[PDB]
């Protein structure tokens, strides 16, 4: 299936965490295509900055066989 | 545990029934002789296939037991008497029980356990059963041994063994030494075995000196008392041979060679202790040297 | 959960009292037993699988329980029963270390009887298996530590039955 | 024709009868197919050159 | 069975059965006669397959019946043959059902744990399964045994 | 759950026995009836929404349930009733394909009566709806497939009652 | 490393090293001479301990060296003893570091998969490590033998 | 048992047990050795008792094993012997319990309906129980024979 | 219900065997304990009212439970709590005599938790009261019979929880 | 009596007495000699036992004999001693009968109502019966005292 490799930086806004938070502060993950929209919406609502997005799996414009 | 055969005719159930028919003495002698025949006419024991850790504590307790009580405990297991060791044995799997008996036989061969009475001969019925077991196959042999030996120990609701076995009625005896017939060294050996060092060391001269292995001589009567009471603690010696001759100042130079079965500075059991006794002319040991002569075994 | 120390401290706190002579004596007794508890725990942790294997062989194997129609028939059910025995042994070790059965009540026995009743697990068979585990652990650990482990395993048996 | 005295002699307790899953059912088959064990291959670890006797590829 | 597996997948997706699933069910229904023939042959000759497979397994891996092996002794050998019989019966159930769900549920899930607790070589068990498969394939016709051996292969792969 | 094949397999397994003649006969019967079940399942899957529509129309439209104050008055309540009907249709189709009613107990009937009693849902009305669903599905599916579908729908109704 | 474990726990709780943890590190570093003496003894006596443990293991489980077994054959026995030496070296690493983590890292994680792929009996490997522990206890003092027994029993339990 | 019966009566009246029940319970508990001994006697002689009782019963009543009889046929005769063993076991249970409640609850409620559905003659069953009682009395001392015959005649009377 | 004798008899019967040595040992143990059980039952019957009185005075009186708004406020509610304690003591004595906690399970526990949940009865406080009853009974009967009574009292508490 | 209670239970079940019930009846018949001995002891020492019991009760609870108490005056003391004698006779009857049924049906049912009507302290009466039990235990043999203690405790509990 189509997968998105996304790198983003999401800062904290409400509390000053005292545990190691770099891993979820700046990270890259492989989110599925069917979840990419909601993941992007979550990152934007949390206030993160989408550093980079790439289509790691599949090819653009695949009418069939995108599974 | 595993399903034990009880009555199916054939050969294995018949052999197990015959073993059960044999009394406690016959069964115990038969299992001992079967262990003796193991590896040549019977299957070789493979204790790694059984959880011997469960019986490890009982084995160590038996090993620490004195030979009389060792034989008493083994005969209690044979008679299915009510003892804590019998309970522990009965609470084991058949493989664990068989491995435990194999370890007992191995320790008896190595001398750590009181051996069978010397010159014992297997009864006719037990010998016939053992011959049948030898004729049996390897798997058949192990199945027969397991089924025969599982019934031992004490289990609630079971009570038999009408014949029973009242067992058979070293340190107390003179230490068997070849070429040495001196009361001083004999008393020294007996007292050292008995661990009554306070009475043992009177055989030492007032200027008596002791030479422990790998250490310089220790001089002073109370020094030797301290050495005996802090280093040489509860060790068993088996002197074998010895020679005696005179020496300067009227001394008696006596070289005795024997074996120590107790842990004493390493080389356990397989170290030859040489006692170099420069005894005073009056008799007390002026100089005792204990030399731990070693076999090709090294790392001491 | 509460160990012996926490139990004593809670008993003192409930009455709002400092640790008096009796509480100190109880703490001293627990500290004395601590070495034996640690040794028994290490031995059990080493021989974890062996104890369960021997107990199931002694009490369950070669029976209607393992034969078809028994609760321990399928491989899945055998694995589940072995896992349950492993949990019992581990939590009994926890209870022995802590000197208290609070962990047993809080994380094992809560609803365990209802769980077996709903599942159809034979309570008597499970109790016999735990008894076999107790005997095996006693033989493998010793007298006093074996007795303590038996106390907590019998606590589990009482809760289950 | 049937004789009942024979079966009266041949009566067996019900609880002694073997069920489906009992290995005693296959005990007879195992007896028939006598498996031959392996003769013990006496080997000494002391007389083994670990560095050389281990395979190299 | 295949019916239950298709129903489970369809309900997990929250949908009625697709044309592919329905066609698979109908094809299995049509071909069930050969499956029943396989089950009949296996059940009828089950003593023969178990006997010959045990013989071949003991020959190929004699340490199993050697001293210190798990199957040492008459009782251990009998239990070995009993487990072989369970696996043959499970193979028959899977062949009849057209899916290996019953085999997985009864004698494949947790089999590693059970045999590890019992001290048994899982690879030896897989070898025994392979021996049974060879004997059964010899006992049946080419294509019939050819598609009967698929479940034997599944068991062998899952155990080894 | 379990189909008829699963039931036969489970009975043979629990008795620890190979598939005997009677099990083969039952399997042959299920295989004989399988094509019918596949046809009925295909028909109902093709016409899933429609059958629900006429079931409601013949059963619940312009009635006290759909009036204000009923349990099916509001649009959200109508959607919930439709979802209930679609569950019942889907699971009756599943049971029809599997030849077994175990699925309904596992999924639907295991808590549905308590669910409706907590909700206030009219079980008499839902029984009437499913009873109408019987004939609505039977019309599209035929006579014997209709009989099977009616068997499963009667199962649902009896579980509700 | 006991210090590394303390650092890991302190970082996990997001705190500086506890006074008790620092005291434990201090005591370990003070006793490091005695701790490393055990490793020196094991390294010096690696050959005799490995060979004696292998012989005792073969005595206890003759099936593995019997034909059809994993260790059957001169080369197979050689590589089995080679793995014995590996595990002895790992035990020395653990006793030096004061922590079982190096043992678990190099020679314990994935050991189940490795020996399943090789066909090796993990139970036999555990028994061999037990024999190694017994031999080392014989060759060392009671206190040192008890100290190394912790690492040996850890390896035994992780094996089985 | 008497304990269960007394506790049930006390519960039904919503009261503790009276001393007139407690002393009866004490006497029952004290006099349990003889009941136990009779139990081991019967259980040891179960096979011989069953065989002799069945032989005597079949000699006395030929129609049972005759063509058209309920026990006619091999399996039928074996099943009749099984029923005899069942009732012997129940009698042993009652003897041990010092009460007939276990027998009545286990194999005495609905016995008439069960054997009527089976077609078996309940009178013939009672005759078999009578023969069993005679054999048990022969194998037991005078007092023990009478005590066991109490339960035996209770069973016989309940059967017919 | 079931006593020790009926329990062992049923355990043998369900698997269809005669009474072996192991079961006979259990019956011998029960017969050995019968005298102590009867003495304890007589003592508890003599001191039934006093035991409940002392337990209530030691656990419940002057607490939040008796004050207005508590579950023991009205005189009727106080008498109900006393009656519950009377049940628990009497049935603990029954189970102690029988040597089996089956009468407790089938006449005191099956649904009692549901009844208290409906009525709002504080299960923790009733457990505390039962513990007080256990302590008083132990003090009045002795350690050997006190432990046996406490076994079934704790059984009741665990069933309630 | 135990005999009449057993007969009532058997009639309620609509059956003859079970072997256990018959054994209990026989045991009670055998113990009837000891029961008669205890009754003889009590009836012989009727006067002294009631005298010490009344004196002990008066010392324990002087408020009864104090002004305003129910038993104030020589006539009230005579009535109290008459009640003492009546209850001791009831205890003797119960010991003879082997159960507390005669005691309950003669002077133990409605005792609370009668004392509420008369104003008598029920707790005082219970303490008086307890003093009677203490003096009787001191006066008679331990086994006989132990046997009568159950009946005395039953009476005192019913009066509590
Ligand atoms: C102070 C010397 C300088 C400074 C600080 C500053 N930091 C942030 C935000 C973050 N800092 C970190 C760094 C870490 N997180 C970790 O877990 C670790 C490794 C253990 C490090 C080094 C991160 C990840 C952030 C992101 C936000 C967060 O902390 O979750 C800010 C801005 C915070 C914000 O939300 O705007 C600031 C101001 N600023 C200076 O000018 C100093 C030179
Ligand atoms: C009119 C603007 C559109 C239209 C209407 C139409 N509706 C139906 C049937 C129903 N409509 C409803 C809707 C509601 N019921 C409620 O209680 C609520 C909130 C108060 C709503 C929104 C319902 C429940 C029905 C079912 C009949 C019944 O309630 O008894 C129909 C007839 C459908 C049929 O086939 O019977 C029609 C025609 N049609 C249009 O074309 C307009 C866009
Ligand atoms: C005074 C005229 C008499 C008397 C009183 C007395 N009462 C107690 C203890 C309690 N009294 C009650 C009664 C009630 N609580 C209620 O809620 C109701 C209805 C509203 C009633 C009638 C209770 C529950 C108790 C228990 C203690 C508590 O309140 O929590 C005592 C003390 C008893 C003791 O030993 O603690 C006393 C002294 N005593 C007399 O002699 C007078 C005749
Ligand atoms: C239906 C699914 C299912 C499975 C799989 C199963 C396995 C199974 N095999 C067992 C034992 C056993 N199984 C074997 C068999 C073997 N020995 C070998 O060397 C071979 C590799 C292997 C056979 C090919 C042996 C030897 C035992 C005895 C183990 C012991 O007693 O220690 C046992 C425990 C004893 C008992 O049967 O009661 C179970 C549960 N039971 C089930 O119900
Ligand atoms: C292979 C294999 C195994 C099987 C291993 C096997 C087969 C193990 C079995 C080993 C055997 C046969 C052990 C028997 C030992 C006998 C002893 C100790 C008796 C001594 C008698 C005494 C002291 C009495 C002496 C006497 C005295 C004192 C008297 O007073 C009077 C005379 C008398 C002579 C009686 C395992 C089960 C481990 C695992 C699986 C597996 O494959």
């Amino acid at each position: 299936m189509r997968m998105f490799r996304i790198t983003a930086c999401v800062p904290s806004q409400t509390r000053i965490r005292t545990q190691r938070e770099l891993q979820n502060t700046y990270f890259t993950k492989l989110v599925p295509y069917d979840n990419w929209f909601r993941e992007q919406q979550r990152i934007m609502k949390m206030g993160g900055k989408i550093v980079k997005v790439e289509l790691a799996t599949g090819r653009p414009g695949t009418n069939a066989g995108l599974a | 545990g595993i399903f034990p055969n009880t009555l199916a005719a054939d050969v294995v159930p018949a052999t197990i029934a015959r073993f059960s028919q044999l009394n406690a003495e016959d069964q115990l002698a038969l299992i001992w002789f079967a262990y003796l025949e193991m590896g040549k006419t019977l299957t070789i024991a493979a204790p790694g296939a059984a959880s011997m850790q469960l019986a490890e504590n009982a084995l160590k307790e038996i090993q620490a037991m004195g030979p009389l009580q060792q034989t008493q405990a083994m005969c209690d297991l044979a008679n299915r008497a009510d003892t804590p060791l019998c309970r522990t044995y009965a609470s084991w799997s058949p493989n664990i029980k068989l491995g435990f008996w194999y370890r007992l036989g191995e320790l008896m061969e190595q001398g750590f356990v009181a051996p069978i009475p010397a010159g014992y001969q297997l009864s006719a019925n037990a010998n016939a059963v053992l011959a049948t077991i030898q004729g049996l196959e390897s798997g058949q042999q192990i199945t027969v041994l397991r089924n025969a030996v599982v019934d031992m120990g004490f289990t609630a609701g079971k009570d038999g063994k009408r014949i029973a076995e009242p067992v058979v009625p070293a340190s107390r005896t003179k230490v068997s030494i070849e070429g040495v017939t001196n009361a001083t060294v004999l008393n020294y050996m007996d007292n050292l075995n008995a661990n009554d060092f306070d009475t043992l060391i009177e055989l030492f001269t007032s200027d008596g000196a002791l030479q422990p292995p790998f250490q310089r001589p220790i001089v002073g009567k109370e020094n030797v008392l301290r050495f005996f009471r802090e280093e040489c603690q509860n060790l068993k010696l088996i002197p074998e041979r010895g020679v005696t001759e005179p020496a300067e100042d009227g001394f008696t130079q006596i070289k005795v060679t024997g074996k120590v079965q107790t842990p004493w500075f390493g080389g356990n059991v397989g170290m030859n202790i040489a006692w170099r006794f420069l005894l005073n002319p009056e008799g007390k040991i002026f100089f005792v040297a204990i030399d731990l002569l070693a076999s090709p075994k090294e790392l001491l | 959960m509460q160990d012996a120390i926490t139990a004593v401290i809670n008993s003192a706190d409930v009455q709002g009292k400092y640790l008096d002579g009796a509480a100190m004596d109880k703490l001293k007794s627990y500290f004395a037993s601590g070495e034996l508890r640690v040794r028994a725990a290490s031995v059990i942790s080493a021989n974890a699988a062996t104890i369960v294997k021997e107990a199931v062989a002694k009490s369950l194997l070669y029976s209607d329980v393992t034969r078809p129609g028994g609760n321990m028939y399928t491989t899945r059910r055998y694995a589940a029963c072995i896992r349950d025995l492993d949990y019992y042994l581990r939590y009994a070790t926890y209870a022995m270390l802590a000197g208290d059965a609070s962990i047993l009540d809080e994380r094992v026995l809560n609803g365990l009887k209802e769980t077996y009743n709903s599942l159809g697990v034979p309570i008597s068979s499970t109790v016999q298996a735990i008894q076999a585990i107790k005997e095996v652990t006693a033989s493998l650990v010793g007298a006093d530590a074996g007795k303590e482990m038996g106390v907590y395993l019998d606590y589990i048996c009482s809760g289950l039955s | 024709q049937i004789v009942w005295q024979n079966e009266v002699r041949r009566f067996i307790p019900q609880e002694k009868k073997l069920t489906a899953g009992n290995p005693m059912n296959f005990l007879g088959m195992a007896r028939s197919i006598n498996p031959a064990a392996n003769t013990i291959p006496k080997v000494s670890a002391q007389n083994i050159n670990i560095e050389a006797s281990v395979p190299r590829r | 069975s295949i019916v239950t597996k298709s129903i489970v997948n369809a309900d997990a997706e929250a949908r009625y059965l697709s044309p592919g699933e329905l066609d698979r069910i109908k094809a299995f229904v049509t071909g069930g006669a050969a499956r029943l023939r396989i089950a009949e042959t296996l059940t009828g000759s089950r003593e023969t397959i178990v006997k010959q497979a045990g013989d071949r397994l003991f020959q190929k891996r004699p340490d199993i019946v050697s001293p210190g092996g798990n199957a040492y002794g008459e009782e251990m050998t009998a239990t070995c043959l009993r487990d072989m019989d369970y696996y043959l019966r499970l193979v028959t159930y899977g062949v009849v059902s057209g899916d290996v769900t019953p085999i997985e549920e009864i004698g494949l899930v947790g089999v590693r744990e059970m045999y590890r607790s019992l001290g048994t070589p899982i690879e030896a068990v897989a070898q025994s399964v392979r021996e049974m498969k060879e004997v059964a394939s010899g006992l049946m016709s080419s294509d019939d045994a050819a598609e009967a051996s698929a479940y034997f292969d599944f068991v062998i792969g899952k155990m080894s």
Side-chain angles (χ1 to χ4, degrees), chain A, chain B, chain C, chain D, chain E:
Chain A
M1 66 179 287
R2 298 166 292 173
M3 297 298 294
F4 273 120
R5 210 196 313 280
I6 65 167
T7 298
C9 196
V10 293
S12 69
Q13 300 292 140
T14 65
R15 63 187 295 272
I16 301 300
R17 312 168 279 189
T18 60
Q19 294 182 357
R20 175 177 138 67
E21 294 305 333
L22 185 143
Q23 72 284 21
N24 58 50
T25 292
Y26 199 71
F27 56 88
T28 182
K29 63 201 284 190
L30 268 170
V31 304
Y33 190 96
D34 271 9
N35 281 173
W36 161 234
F37 191 89
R38 181 165 167 78
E39 184 65 5
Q40 201 186 9
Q41 196 64 65
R42 287 182 61 255
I43 307 314
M44 294 165 176
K45 299 167 112 160
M46 185 184 290
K49 300 181 188 296
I50 298 294
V51 171
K52 185 173 72 66
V53 168
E54 70 180 2
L55 189 61
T57 55
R59 62 191 65 185
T62 300
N63 288 310
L66 58 84
Chain B
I2 313 163
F3 59 101
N5 299 292
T6 185
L7 287 175
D10 196 75
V11 54
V12 187
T15 312
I16 299 167
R18 281 208 293 144
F19 190 95
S20 178
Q21 299 306 348
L22 304 178
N23 60 4
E25 298 185 353
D26 287 330
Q27 292 174 352
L28 196 42
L30 175 51
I31 70 167
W32 160 247
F33 282 119
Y35 164 72
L36 286 182
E37 290 295 331
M38 280 176 61
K40 60 184 74 65
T41 193
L42 294 178
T43 78
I44 61 170
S51 300
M52 286 328 300
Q53 307 90 19
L54 305 185
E56 200 276 337
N57 289 318
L59 278 184
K60 284 202 287 186
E61 186 268 352
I62 286 297
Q63 202 169 329
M65 290 181 72
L68 164 58
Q69 46 269 31
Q70 295 177 355
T71 293
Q72 180 49 26
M74 284 189 282
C75 300
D76 290 327
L77 283 178
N79 295 263
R80 290 79 181 275
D82 182 73
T83 65
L85 179 48
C86 283
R87 302 288 186 88
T88 304
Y89 175 83
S91 68
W92 286 335
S93 63
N95 270 18
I96 289 170
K97 297 163 147 156
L98 203 61
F100 160 75
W101 281 103
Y102 177 76
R103 266 306 295 191
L104 284 182
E106 190 175 3
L107 290 173
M108 288 176 68
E109 290 182 353
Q110 294 180 357
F112 298 98
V113 177
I116 183 172
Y120 187 87
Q121 296 303 109
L122 193 66
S123 177
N125 297 339
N127 172 60
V129 174
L130 188 152
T132 297
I133 291 173
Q134 297 159 291
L136 293 177
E137 284 283 343
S138 282
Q140 299 176 314
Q141 276 160 338
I142 182 154
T143 292
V144 163
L145 291 170
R146 206 148 38 198
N147 285 317
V149 73
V150 64
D151 283 319
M152 291 180 182
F154 185 78
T155 61
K158 293 179 178 179
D159 44 355
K161 276 65 60 179
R162 297 294 183 269
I163 296 89
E165 201 282 336
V167 297
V168 291
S171 180
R172 75 279 191 190
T173 60
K174 175 261 187 184
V175 55
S176 52
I177 194 59
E178 207 281 334
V180 187
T181 55
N182 53 356
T184 302
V185 168
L186 298 175
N187 285 318
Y188 173 86
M189 288 284 108
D190 293 330
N191 290 342
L192 201 66
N193 286 330
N195 307 300
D196 51 357
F197 306 144
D198 53 356
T199 305
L200 159 66
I201 200 160
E202 279 75 356
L203 311 175
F204 280 65
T205 318
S206 60
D207 60 351
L210 194 147
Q211 163 74 40
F214 314 103
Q215 288 289 37
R216 299 215 180 200
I218 298 160
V219 293
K221 279 192 69 64
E222 55 269 16
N223 275 308
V224 183
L225 277 296
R226 171 181 57 185
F227 174 77
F228 281 161
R229 64 182 68 264
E230 78 185 5
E231 280 276 10
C232 166
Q233 189 61 77
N234 295 73
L235 61 83
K236 305 295 96 172
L237 306 184
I238 304 302
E240 293 168 346
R241 199 177 53 79
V243 73
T244 298
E245 69 267 18
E248 297 85 1
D249 296 333
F251 291 163
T252 308
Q253 206 284 336
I254 305 157
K255 201 175 298 292
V256 186
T257 44
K259 295 191 77 64
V260 59
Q261 287 183 333
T262 306
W264 165 246
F265 275 121
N268 292 319
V269 173
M271 281 300 109
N272 291 294
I273 294 175
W275 309 271
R276 172 180 164 90
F277 271 58
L278 191 63
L279 300 168
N280 221 18
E282 54 85 20
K284 305 297 96 175
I285 175 60
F286 160 75
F287 169 79
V288 55
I290 316 302
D291 307 345
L292 291 177
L293 307 169
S295 65
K297 172 187 174 183
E298 193 271 331
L299 275 298
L300 273 295
Chain C
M1 64 169 286
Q2 295 86 18
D3 56 359
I5 306 173
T6 294
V8 173
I9 280 174
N10 288 350
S11 87
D13 196 352
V14 171
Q15 291 174 355
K17 278 147 46 150
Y18 284 78
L19 296 155
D20 58 353
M24 297 287 198
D25 285 333
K26 293 185 184 294
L27 292 172
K28 281 167 181 337
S29 66
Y30 176 72
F31 286 136
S33 67
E35 289 292 335
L36 278 297
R37 291 171 200 286
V38 165
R39 177 156 54 251
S42 180
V43 173
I44 288 157
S45 173
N47 307 295
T50 298
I51 285 164
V52 177
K53 167 187 131 73
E54 303 308 334
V56 304
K58 168 177 166 63
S59 59
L60 302 166
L61 294 179
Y62 301 108
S63 301
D64 49 312
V65 172
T66 68
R67 274 182 323 253
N71 211 40
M72 270 208 297
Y73 165 61
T74 65
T75 68
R76 183 190 26 100
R77 282 177 170 176
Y78 191 104
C81 183
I82 302 318
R83 151 178 59 63
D84 281 22
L85 287 196
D86 289 328
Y87 275 55
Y88 292 153
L89 181 63
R90 180 159 52 85
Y91 277 101
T93 318
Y94 292 160
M96 185 261 311
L97 278 170
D100 190 289
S102 313
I103 185 163
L104 288 176
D105 278 286
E106 265 157 25
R107 309 194 45 65
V108 162
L109 293 162
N110 56 340
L112 183 54
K113 192 173 188 294
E114 293 79 1
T115 305
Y116 291 170
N117 279 348
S118 63
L119 288 174
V121 171
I123 299 298
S124 47
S125 295
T126 295
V127 170
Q128 300 173 11
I130 298 182
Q131 297 293 327
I133 278 178
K134 173 177 72 174
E135 293 180 355
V136 174
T137 314
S139 86
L140 183 57
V141 168
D144 46 358
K147 183 181 292 295
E148 197 70 21
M149 281 296 296
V151 172
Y152 295 117
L153 288 160
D154 293 316
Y155 190 87
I156 295 170
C157 285
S158 307
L160 203 53
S161 86
Chain D
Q1 196 270 331
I2 186 58
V3 57
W4 57 264
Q5 296 82 334
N6 288 49
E7 198 157 5
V8 177
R9 282 175 313 97
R10 199 178 62 246
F11 159 82
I12 294 164
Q14 195 194 38
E15 64 273 19
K16 298 291 182 67
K17 316 194 155 312
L18 292 178
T19 176
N22 212 318
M24 291 183 182
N25 307 274
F26 302 90
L27 181 59
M29 172 201 282
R31 296 195 164 133
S32 69
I33 174 179
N34 192 358
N38 286 321
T39 69
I40 180 60
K42 299 289 94 176
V43 296
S44 55
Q46 298 294 324
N47 294 139
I48 304 168
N49 187 0
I50 301 301
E51 179 58 27
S53 66
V54 167
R56 183 65 55 80
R57 289 206 298 265
Chain E
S1 67
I2 192 65
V3 183
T4 299
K5 183 176 176 290
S6 297
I7 280 181
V8 173
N9 280 358
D11 186 28
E13 285 182 349
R15 46 145 191 87
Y16 291 79
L17 284 184
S18 51
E21 307 193 279
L22 296 149
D23 199 356
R24 178 172 184 173
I25 284 173
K26 66 180 291 297
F28 163 77
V29 168
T30 59
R35 295 182 183 274
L36 289 175
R37 262 190 304 96
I38 304 194
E40 286 292 332
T41 69
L42 297 199
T43 300
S45 52
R46 66 184 183 273
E47 79 288 19
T48 306
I49 294 90
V50 176
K51 186 78 171 294
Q52 287 182 243
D55 197 301
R56 291 188 185 180
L57 165 73
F58 295 151
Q59 293 177 356
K60 284 182 62 65
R61 185 176 288 267
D63 62 357
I64 296 301
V65 297
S66 292
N70 189 179
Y72 197 43
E74 295 298 333
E75 61 277 15
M76 288 300 185
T77 296
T79 319
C80 174
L81 301 168
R82 198 278 315 279
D83 293 341
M84 295 188 69
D85 189 42
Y86 291 170
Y87 278 114
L88 180 46
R89 175 167 54 81
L90 303 184
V91 164
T92 66
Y93 290 161
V95 168
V96 166
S97 71
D99 184 78
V100 76
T101 304
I103 303 171
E104 205 166 350
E105 279 324 303
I106 293 152
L108 289 181
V109 169
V111 63
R112 298 291 179 90
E113 278 82 352
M114 171 184 64
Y115 274 137
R116 171 184 308 144
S117 71
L118 289 172
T120 304
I122 201 71
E123 72 284 12
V125 194
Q127 187 46 33
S128 61
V129 184
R130 215 172 292 126
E131 297 300 328
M132 314 180 209
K133 171 183 109 183
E134 315 297 355
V135 178
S137 183
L139 285 175
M140 288 188 286
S141 68
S142 64
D143 53 355
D144 207 4
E147 55 89 13
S149 308
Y151 304 94
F152 283 119
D153 286 346
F154 181 88
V155 188
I156 299 168
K158 186 60 66 68
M159 304 195 77
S160 75

